[PDB]
């Protein structure tokens, strides 16, 4: 049978030229107590760590 994508991982990751990009955690709620620096530095996308790239490749084989 064809390999099946893990759709949760597909919804959480996207592919770049040499890796995968992802969003950052701790920005959904409980935001008042956090300082402005954390608020603005937890915004945007970062890269998937090389320790997790292999697992991401196993879970999402077509992206």
């Amino acid at each position: 049978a064809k390999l099946k994508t893990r759709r949760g991982a597909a919804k959480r990751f996207k592919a770049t030229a040499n890796g995968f990009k992802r969003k950052q955690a701790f920005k959904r709620h409980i935001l008042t107590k956090k300082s402005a620096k954390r608020i603005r530095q937890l915004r945007g996308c970062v890269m998937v760590h090389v320790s997790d790239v292999a697992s991401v490749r196993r879970m999402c084989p077509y992206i």
Binding site: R6, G8, A9, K11, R12, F13, K14, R22, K23, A25, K27, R28, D52, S55, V56, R58, M59
Partner: protein, 144 residues
Amino acid sequence: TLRLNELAPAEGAKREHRRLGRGIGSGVGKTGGRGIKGQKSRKSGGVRPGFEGGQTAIYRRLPKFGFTSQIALKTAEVRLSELSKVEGDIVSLETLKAANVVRRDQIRARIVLSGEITRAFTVQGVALTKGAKAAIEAAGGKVE
């Protein structure tokens, strides 16, 4: 020479497959490379990919983001150097589909500056970047 018993494959083309559990001298006897006991030594022993022993996984402790656009599935991208496969001088969506650089179900295309062209082309109804238009005009074509 040239007989059914005088033909050979190239060196390194074929290898013997590995056979487990066939004695001490083979080096993979007894356990067959699986180690001693535990879940991974059993039949069908590996755990599901993405399982990390119980803690919240990498794809579940991170948030979802984005939405999928439907028009992106029908937008097609064409390299400038692929215009060489076009037969004739007119470059259009139908002609690119006939030349097999665009899938038949796409409804529009864009030309990017990637390679080089030599012939003079006429473009009708295909989007061009600023570099690609300059390249086309330098080669000797016109737009629309």
